[PDB]
Amino acid sequence: MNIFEMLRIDEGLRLKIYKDTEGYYTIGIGHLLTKSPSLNAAKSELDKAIGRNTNGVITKDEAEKLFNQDVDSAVRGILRNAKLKPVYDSLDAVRRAALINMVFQMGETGVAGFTNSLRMLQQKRWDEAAVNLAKSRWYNQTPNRAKRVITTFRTGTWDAYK
Ligand SMILES: [Cl-]
Ligand SMILES: [Cl-]
């Protein structure tokens, strides 16, 4: 298992514009298009992201291409962030994937906001970090996905994904 396979399981793949769990226009493997309510504003972001007139539909290759860019960006954002970087540097390979997953979902700003859980992960207090991570809107809104990520932080294995 790796970060790509992990995120593909959590996000799914859809080739037509759809609304995510928050009601926002998305496409592909979890690629947020816009927070605006307008489907036209979403189609316009889509065409711009793909470089062609898509009429709201993309191919598998185009989905995978946005996905590779989004993972790359999540990693680079973590490495640029003064709060996240030290946590990432301290973790083993599996747990690094869990952190990337959270950043991919909620953005660097949102994750950097989990001040206490970050400190706990850095200190390697797995059980305590898992309890603190669950006291969040994140966990309450998307509990099945949150549990999978949290178990990955707790155990350092891919068991939740197998
Ligand atoms: Cl983009
Ligand atoms: Cl969920």
mmCIF file of C-alpha atoms and ligand atoms in Angstrom:
data_model
loop_
_atom_site.group_PDB
_atom_site.id
_atom_site.type_symbol
_atom_site.label_atom_id
_atom_site.label_comp_id
_atom_site.label_asym_id
_atom_site.label_seq_id
_atom_site.Cartn_x
_atom_site.Cartn_y
_atom_site.Cartn_z
ATOM 1 C CA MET A 1 0.000 0.000 0.000
ATOM 2 C CA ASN A 2 1.241 3.562 -0.511
ATOM 3 C CA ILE A 3 -0.143 7.116 -0.353
ATOM 4 C CA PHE A 4 -1.721 6.849 -3.827
ATOM 5 C CA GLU A 5 -3.580 3.643 -3.125
ATOM 6 C CA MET A 6 -4.574 4.955 0.276
ATOM 7 C CA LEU A 7 -6.058 8.188 -1.062
ATOM 8 C CA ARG A 8 -7.721 6.344 -3.974
ATOM 9 C CA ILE A 9 -9.629 4.214 -1.450
ATOM 10 C CA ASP A 10 -10.647 7.256 0.652
ATOM 11 C CA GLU A 11 -11.637 9.530 -2.164
ATOM 12 C CA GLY A 12 -12.919 7.165 -4.885
ATOM 13 C CA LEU A 13 -12.806 8.119 -8.555
ATOM 14 C CA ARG A 14 -15.512 10.011 -10.431
ATOM 15 C CA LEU A 15 -15.223 11.227 -13.960
ATOM 16 C CA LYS A 16 -18.064 13.802 -13.887
ATOM 17 C CA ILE A 17 -18.390 16.887 -11.630
ATOM 18 C CA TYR A 18 -19.903 15.814 -8.260
ATOM 19 C CA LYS A 19 -20.453 17.342 -4.882
ATOM 20 C CA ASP A 20 -18.142 16.244 -2.044
ATOM 21 C CA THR A 21 -19.278 15.496 1.543
ATOM 22 C CA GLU A 22 -19.377 19.269 2.255
ATOM 23 C CA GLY A 23 -21.452 19.943 -0.839
ATOM 24 C CA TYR A 24 -18.540 21.356 -2.903
ATOM 25 C CA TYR A 25 -17.956 20.782 -6.567
ATOM 26 C CA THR A 26 -15.254 18.160 -7.091
ATOM 27 C CA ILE A 27 -14.013 15.811 -9.796
ATOM 28 C CA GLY A 28 -11.634 12.862 -10.189
ATOM 29 C CA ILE A 29 -9.889 11.578 -7.075
ATOM 30 C CA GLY A 30 -11.001 14.196 -4.593
ATOM 31 C CA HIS A 31 -9.892 17.237 -6.576
ATOM 32 C CA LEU A 32 -11.846 20.218 -5.185
ATOM 33 C CA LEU A 33 -12.842 22.602 -7.968
ATOM 34 C CA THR A 34 -14.529 25.477 -6.154
ATOM 35 C CA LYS A 35 -16.410 26.308 -2.997
ATOM 36 C CA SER A 36 -18.793 28.397 -5.021
ATOM 37 C CA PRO A 37 -22.359 27.193 -5.473
ATOM 38 C CA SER A 38 -22.241 27.765 -9.160
ATOM 39 C CA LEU A 39 -21.897 24.778 -11.410
ATOM 40 C CA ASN A 40 -20.702 27.175 -14.073
ATOM 41 C CA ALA A 41 -17.984 28.504 -11.889
ATOM 42 C CA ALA A 42 -16.979 24.788 -11.340
ATOM 43 C CA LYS A 43 -16.958 23.972 -15.075
ATOM 44 C CA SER A 44 -14.809 26.983 -15.690
ATOM 45 C CA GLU A 45 -12.251 25.908 -13.026
ATOM 46 C CA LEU A 46 -12.338 22.451 -14.496
ATOM 47 C CA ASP A 47 -11.512 23.611 -18.051
ATOM 48 C CA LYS A 48 -8.758 25.773 -16.703
ATOM 49 C CA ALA A 49 -7.274 22.905 -14.672
ATOM 50 C CA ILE A 50 -7.348 20.455 -17.660
ATOM 51 C CA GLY A 51 -6.510 22.903 -20.469
ATOM 52 C CA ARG A 52 -9.501 22.000 -22.651
ATOM 53 C CA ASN A 53 -13.258 22.480 -22.959
ATOM 54 C CA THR A 54 -14.473 19.633 -20.939
ATOM 55 C CA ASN A 55 -18.176 20.195 -20.504
ATOM 56 C CA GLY A 56 -17.781 18.701 -16.917
ATOM 57 C CA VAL A 57 -16.377 15.350 -17.863
ATOM 58 C CA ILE A 58 -12.723 14.133 -17.879
ATOM 59 C CA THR A 59 -10.958 10.900 -18.695
ATOM 60 C CA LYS A 60 -9.229 8.501 -16.306
ATOM 61 C CA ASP A 61 -5.758 9.789 -17.421
ATOM 62 C CA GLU A 62 -6.765 13.416 -16.759
ATOM 63 C CA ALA A 63 -8.121 12.362 -13.262
ATOM 64 C CA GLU A 64 -4.854 10.644 -12.516
ATOM 65 C CA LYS A 65 -2.911 13.632 -13.666
ATOM 66 C CA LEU A 66 -4.764 16.024 -11.273
ATOM 67 C CA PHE A 67 -4.233 13.407 -8.574
ATOM 68 C CA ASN A 68 -0.451 13.245 -9.037
ATOM 69 C CA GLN A 69 -0.326 17.060 -8.887
ATOM 70 C CA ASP A 70 -2.445 17.185 -5.766
ATOM 71 C CA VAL A 71 -0.336 14.608 -3.873
ATOM 72 C CA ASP A 72 2.840 16.388 -4.907
ATOM 73 C CA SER A 73 1.413 19.647 -3.716
ATOM 74 C CA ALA A 74 0.292 18.201 -0.366
ATOM 75 C CA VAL A 75 3.803 16.850 0.281
ATOM 76 C CA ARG A 76 5.510 20.134 -0.787
ATOM 77 C CA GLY A 77 3.039 22.148 1.364
ATOM 78 C CA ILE A 78 3.882 19.993 4.440
ATOM 79 C CA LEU A 79 7.627 20.497 3.784
ATOM 80 C CA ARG A 80 7.142 24.241 3.545
ATOM 81 C CA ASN A 81 5.079 24.528 6.620
ATOM 82 C CA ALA A 82 6.970 25.438 9.830
ATOM 83 C CA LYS A 83 4.363 23.556 11.890
ATOM 84 C CA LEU A 84 3.998 20.484 9.819
ATOM 85 C CA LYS A 85 7.493 19.891 8.672
ATOM 86 C CA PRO A 86 8.914 18.912 12.034
ATOM 87 C CA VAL A 87 6.073 16.485 12.627
ATOM 88 C CA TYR A 88 6.545 14.868 9.191
ATOM 89 C CA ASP A 89 10.321 14.611 9.737
ATOM 90 C CA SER A 90 9.769 12.807 13.003
ATOM 91 C CA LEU A 91 7.415 10.089 11.654
ATOM 92 C CA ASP A 92 8.031 6.683 10.086
ATOM 93 C CA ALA A 93 6.907 6.042 6.436
ATOM 94 C CA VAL A 94 3.452 4.768 7.179
ATOM 95 C CA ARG A 95 2.519 7.544 9.513
ATOM 96 C CA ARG A 96 3.851 10.158 7.057
ATOM 97 C CA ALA A 97 1.229 8.846 4.594
ATOM 98 C CA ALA A 98 -1.489 9.453 7.239
ATOM 99 C CA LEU A 99 -0.375 13.016 7.645
ATOM 100 C CA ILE A 100 -0.359 13.535 3.878
ATOM 101 C CA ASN A 101 -3.896 12.148 3.736
ATOM 102 C CA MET A 102 -5.164 14.681 6.290
ATOM 103 C CA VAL A 103 -3.436 17.548 4.412
ATOM 104 C CA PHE A 104 -4.896 16.388 1.098
ATOM 105 C CA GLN A 105 -8.411 16.403 2.692
ATOM 106 C CA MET A 106 -8.425 19.507 4.745
ATOM 107 C CA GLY A 107 -5.523 21.574 3.592
ATOM 108 C CA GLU A 108 -2.341 22.593 5.320
ATOM 109 C CA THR A 109 -3.971 25.344 7.288
ATOM 110 C CA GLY A 110 -6.610 23.074 8.712
ATOM 111 C CA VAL A 111 -4.139 20.381 9.780
ATOM 112 C CA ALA A 112 -1.693 22.902 11.239
ATOM 113 C CA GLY A 113 -4.644 23.840 13.437
ATOM 114 C CA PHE A 114 -4.497 20.450 15.248
ATOM 115 C CA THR A 115 -1.858 21.876 17.595
ATOM 116 C CA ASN A 116 -2.223 19.393 20.445
ATOM 117 C CA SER A 117 -2.492 16.268 18.273
ATOM 118 C CA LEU A 118 0.631 17.365 16.314
ATOM 119 C CA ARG A 119 2.596 17.682 19.521
ATOM 120 C CA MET A 120 1.418 14.271 20.594
ATOM 121 C CA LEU A 121 2.421 12.672 17.306
ATOM 122 C CA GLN A 122 5.817 14.277 17.485
ATOM 123 C CA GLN A 123 6.265 12.824 20.927
ATOM 124 C CA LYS A 124 5.170 9.388 19.742
ATOM 125 C CA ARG A 125 2.255 9.125 22.198
ATOM 126 C CA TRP A 126 0.151 7.185 19.702
ATOM 127 C CA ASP A 127 -2.791 6.304 21.898
ATOM 128 C CA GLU A 128 -3.096 9.796 23.244
ATOM 129 C CA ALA A 129 -2.869 11.387 19.792
ATOM 130 C CA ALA A 130 -5.608 9.058 18.507
ATOM 131 C CA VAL A 131 -7.957 10.121 21.287
ATOM 132 C CA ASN A 132 -7.269 13.820 20.680
ATOM 133 C CA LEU A 133 -7.601 13.515 16.893
ATOM 134 C CA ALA A 134 -11.180 12.132 17.355
ATOM 135 C CA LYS A 135 -12.359 15.239 19.197
ATOM 136 C CA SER A 136 -12.782 17.200 16.047
ATOM 137 C CA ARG A 137 -15.409 18.227 13.521
ATOM 138 C CA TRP A 138 -13.302 16.128 11.085
ATOM 139 C CA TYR A 139 -13.968 12.949 12.962
ATOM 140 C CA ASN A 140 -17.622 13.781 13.476
ATOM 141 C CA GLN A 141 -18.334 14.664 9.854
ATOM 142 C CA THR A 142 -16.388 11.835 8.177
ATOM 143 C CA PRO A 143 -16.061 9.198 10.880
ATOM 144 C CA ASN A 144 -15.234 6.147 8.697
ATOM 145 C CA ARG A 145 -12.402 7.889 6.882
ATOM 146 C CA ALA A 146 -11.170 9.614 10.111
ATOM 147 C CA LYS A 147 -11.059 6.194 11.881
ATOM 148 C CA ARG A 148 -8.937 4.713 9.084
ATOM 149 C CA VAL A 149 -6.453 7.579 9.291
ATOM 150 C CA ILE A 150 -6.418 7.589 13.084
ATOM 151 C CA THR A 151 -5.813 3.804 13.218
ATOM 152 C CA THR A 152 -2.877 4.327 10.821
ATOM 153 C CA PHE A 153 -1.399 6.918 13.255
ATOM 154 C CA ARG A 154 -2.102 4.671 16.225
ATOM 155 C CA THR A 155 -0.574 1.512 14.813
ATOM 156 C CA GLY A 156 1.910 2.539 12.189
ATOM 157 C CA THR A 157 0.517 -0.191 9.895
ATOM 158 C CA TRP A 158 -1.872 -0.274 6.905
ATOM 159 C CA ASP A 159 -4.240 -2.604 8.643
ATOM 160 C CA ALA A 160 -7.273 -0.214 8.337
ATOM 161 C CA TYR A 161 -6.837 -0.287 4.593
ATOM 162 C CA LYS A 162 -6.520 -3.996 4.175
HETATM 163 CL CL CL B 1 -5.217 22.656 -10.566
HETATM 164 CL CL CL B 2 -16.469 8.790 6.291
#
